[PDB]
Symmetry: C4
Subunit: 388 residues, 4 copies
């Protein structure tokens, strides 16, 4: 109809209720489910759907051997109905590639997929299900993007890309698209020293992205964007409650403008909702691997370098595998506020469960409640032994 505008503020998050779960690996043990990783959730004005990067093979299929690899000519961004598994028969390909983002602007959807060899990748920006714009690699070192939805405001949908090293400074750019066309792009500015896989959400005409500093930071970099002025800033979450993985143990004081040290060249896509006292951080329970998942209310995490938790909720037990996590919200829901939501990728297979030759995942996702709801833990649920 008309372009959506971020006119609401976030609803108060007093807990998280269950939103969607596809049990993909369980069901896929005996049905035609595509192998995936790097999933997310994204809404249209009339429907919310699960997204991910297919590996172009079923889990039980012999071609599942080797799916631990991240980039191949057989991956594609696919979307499918909420809480269903990604099957060969119900999955809709948005675009071909090994890194992606997607978001609805209120009128139609924009999806971006990057493909190519490491030194010659290119992104093709689709809008209304047609290719419109293409962008060639600028640093010739794995052009890559969000792996979760972008956010739009009055037709302007900013997207964060990174090209260059994963273990040293790289070239991050913020592109501002409108109807699949480039209105403007900036180089990364601010104090964030390395940016990868940003998780974004918007409220009151401002887009907040919680990303990952793969190079040095165990605290997360944050990019805040003004989609009207088409400008941005960057810093790190000040809080001592560190949210990357692997990471060192929590200190008592964090860092606001530098990576918090202790772990180099590694990390996991994550997210956060930074809204003063209504601030919640997501993170794996384990400091060593993508194991477990919890949400922690850390008032003023973004700006208070001594902020510690005041409430929390376990999403996945530390005895269960987790993975990537990101933000999304239904901007077309009724009501006076935007209800914060997120998903957790539940990785199964390699490298942690190597008795199988594949790597895939399932999705669990929650949204906020103003009530103080009881908690449950939500594991993938599959028995690897069955696949043997």
């Amino acid at each position: 109809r008309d372009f959506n505008n971020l006119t609401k503020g976030l609803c108060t998050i007093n807990s998280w209720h269950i939103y969607g779960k596809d049990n993909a690996v369980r069901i896929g043990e005996d049905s035609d489910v595509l192998v995936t990783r790097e999933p997310y959730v994204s809404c249209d004005p009339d429907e919310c759907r699960f997204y991910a990067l297919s590996q172009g093979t079923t889990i039980r299929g012999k071609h599942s051997n080797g799916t631990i690899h991240d980039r191949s000519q057989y991956r594609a961004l696919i979307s499918w109905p909420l809480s269903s598994p990604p099957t060969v028969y119900n999955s809709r390909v948005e675009c071909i590639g090994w890194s992606s983002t997607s978001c609805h602007d209120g009128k139609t959807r924009m999806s971006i997929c990057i493909s190519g060899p490491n030194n010659n990748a290119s992104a093709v920006i689709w809008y209304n299900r047609r290719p419109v714009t293409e962008i060639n690699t600028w640093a010739r070192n794995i052009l890559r993007t969000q792996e979760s939805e972008c956010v739009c405001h009055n037709g302007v949908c900013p997207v964060v890309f990174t090209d260059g090293s994963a273990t040293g400074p790289a070239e991050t750019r913020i592109y501002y698209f409108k109807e699949g066309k480039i209105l403007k792009w900036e180089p990364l500015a601010g104090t964030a020293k390395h940016i990868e896989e940003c998780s974004c959400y918007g409220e009151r005409a401002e887009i907040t992205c919680t990303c990952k500093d793969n190079w040095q930071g165990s605290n997360r970099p944050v990019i805040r964007i003004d989609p009207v002025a088409m400008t941005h800033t960057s810093q790190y979450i000040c809080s001592p409650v560190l949210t990357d993985n692997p990471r060192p143990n929590d200190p008592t004081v964090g860092k606001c403008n530098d990576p918090y040290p202790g772990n180099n060249n590694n990390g996991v896509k994550g997210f956060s909702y930074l809204d003063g006292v209504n601030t919640w951080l997501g993170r794996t329970i384990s400091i060593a691997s993508r194991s477990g998942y919890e949400m922690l209310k850390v008032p003023n995490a973004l700006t208070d370098d001594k902020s510690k938790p005041t409430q929390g909720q376990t999403i996945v037990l530390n005895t269960d595998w987790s993975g990537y996590s990101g933000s999304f919200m239904d901007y077309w829901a009724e009501g006076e506020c935007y209800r914060a939501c997120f998903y957790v990728e539940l990785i199964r297979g390699r490298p942690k469960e190597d008795k199988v030759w594949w790597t895939s995942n399932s999705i669990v996702s929650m949204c906020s409640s103003t009530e103080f709801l009881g908690q449950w833990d939500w594991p993938d649920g599959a028995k690897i032994e069955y696949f043997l």
Copy 2:
């Protein structure tokens, strides 16, 4: 369009004709059919569909082992086209949980799913396919609901929940929702001593629910609701024709305001159509197990404590497995009256057929005819031996 209003009375029930049957277990022996239980049927203004609680695995899948259990993080309310089986590819997830209800108000649908551990469950009420309201467990003992459709009148859709003991008094509440929002809730009132899994239908601005007294009653409790005044009453079906299971043999006089004794802490979801002489009771043929199924015309069953059958119809032979049963009607059908319908869950597998490690079911459903139609029996139809 506009909210539906219960303006018609029930059609005269002179017999029951076949409405839908999915033959899920038969077909699922060699195709991707989800394991389910707790099914029901519910209509939208333009389509009627089968509903049930998936177990998050196919019947032939190895994860089917253990599906006798009622609550896990892998269940979800799914709906699928009428008389089709619940397949991985055609099933639509309404919400995640292990207990549910759902109904269309004329404009859009409201679905409710409860999930959680036993001592910390929570219900999330979805409307127009979006989460709108959440309710935390109030007795910390398996918050649970209908397991069949709710009914709406002018936007108001009452739902019956129970939290607390299954073998002693519990806390039953009647919530009145409008557009997924809580307008009001009452504690159970009346003479019913325990309420679980209510089967409801509406006619002439009144909603009648035939539930189950798991604690002591072999006769069924009945809750009648006025969705305008948003008030209700409760009592038991007076009739000596006892309809729970297991149950003692039929007496010659029943009980109107107390559970009819003889069987404690057990039962099965059931239903009835209470409409003076146009009254029909459904029940298993066996008094010991969920075996067989029949419909009995028992004039004035609700208010006559000596009422006995005047006509009847066998639905399932006593040599075939049955299970839960509930009411639904197509409130958007043409004509001057509402045609009473019901479904019977045909349970296969554990605990009765333990040569297999799973428990699932198929659905058979009928609606009333003003004709006096010949009868057939409708079994599940699957041979367990094939699954061995």
Copy 3:
């Protein structure tokens, strides 16, 4: 929109072109295809679809054992997209039963399914996907109907039913339905001595049905209906070119008002287009079994007792299995005339191919061309050996 009226005459049939073929048995050797028999084709104003009676099991499924039987509680009328196979995932159940008919009146569709034991069957007439009317068996001996589409004119859709003996006189009735409601019914009149499984088509406000005299006739009975006056007549195809099966060899003179003798208590559903010189007869090539299929132009077959062929077209070689055949036309096609179409059921399995324990079929269908097209033969195409 508005009810369709049969205002056109038939197009000149100079040959038959290929219309649809699903290759169901071939494909079903390795995919989830439902076992069927008694198929047909029927159009809506915006789409034409394949129909048949499912057996409630896949072909490869173990429950396929025993599908040679005609009536069970596991059958249902299902429809699916043109030329696709009937799969568990794309098949839409119209109604539950073991004998059926269906037709679109221009506004919406009416489907009829009969179910029950032999001595207590009942038909339930659905309209706009809702049950509207029910008719109980009147002779208590396998109430049965067309097994192909009915035809409508100004909302009136006549249907032919038979109840009683298959090897002696029976009670055939012609029901005239409008919006699923019975406007009137007549007993069979005319000279036809036994009627079963009528194949109908309409043109210029008249409906012609070519049926089967199971009792004594090797020539086909024909019922012509006036859907305005709601009256009909009956006789046999006069032609010596006999079209039932099994049958005696062709004589030089046929019978207009009596069954042509030589074969008792047997036959196959068939059809014809009776339009003066533009008359075409369909029949198996074999006089002994449902083997092969051909179309023969027999000018004035209906009224000329010495009429013999003037042109012809082989549809299926005598070295391939055939089966039932019936008429349908797209009454919503563009142009000045109705293009005659028909389908042939290609039966595979029992009783002829008994190395397998099942019986199913595929569908091949053609429509007329005003050109004189070259011919091909269209077999099922499956190798039974693969199923062993």
Copy 4:
């Protein structure tokens, strides 16, 4: 809405970006994917889809044995969502036959399928999903058509057919259809000596077809059509950069009006975009077999007999199997120009990979970019060993 008119010129082709890829053979190793060959892509005003000729069997199905053969009664033109594989459950049959073409005129789609024995084939032209016209074989020797989309202008959609020898002069005709009806047909004129399987595209009210001279030419014949005057001409691509296969090595001077000699009675469907300096040629890398694939910018290829490459892009490595290739464009995309696109059939199985008894393929397709994008190679991706 209104008939589409070719009012735009082609966009400048500076490179090719990835558009769609279905990975059909990989996925089909463990899922219900139909065996195909002769694929293409074609757009409607609201969606672009993959097309191909099914073999009427799954790849893993036993009936896949023998699919190396080109014509059988089990083939059909099927279409399915872009970048999905052709599965039994998501494939839509357009028409039955072993040679086809299809195109949307802006209002609705016209699809053509030819079926029959070699000496008696016939084409049936469908429009708006209904059969409208039929054309009988005129030379009684494998009536055949494009195997890629046709193009329309103001309701007029020209199609190129060939009937007669594959190794000597044949009878090629250009039919001009409007709403499935024949407006006019011409015999082939110009200097092309043999025409088969034309790949067409339209721009500025002119349709260009790059076909194949199976008899003698290693350079490609080109037919240019004026869909208003309904007239055409023909010649060969002048360029020494030969694009058929097998073929001799490239000379330094080509032929404009005669087949370039060196290879008789063989070839592969191919295409080109002839637009002055904005000219690009597609061809297999190997001169001996359907191996590899590349795009070469050959300015003025059509008219310059010494034209050689000025830029290029590898699509498939010479160490990977390729096959047919053809043109299509989204005539309903936004913007001021038509973006050239093409697909490459990636053949797997027989005759090159004979350890399996089947022959099928997957599809890879690209479209032009005005950017100079980095290149990747796009193989089928399946391991034949897995099918053993």
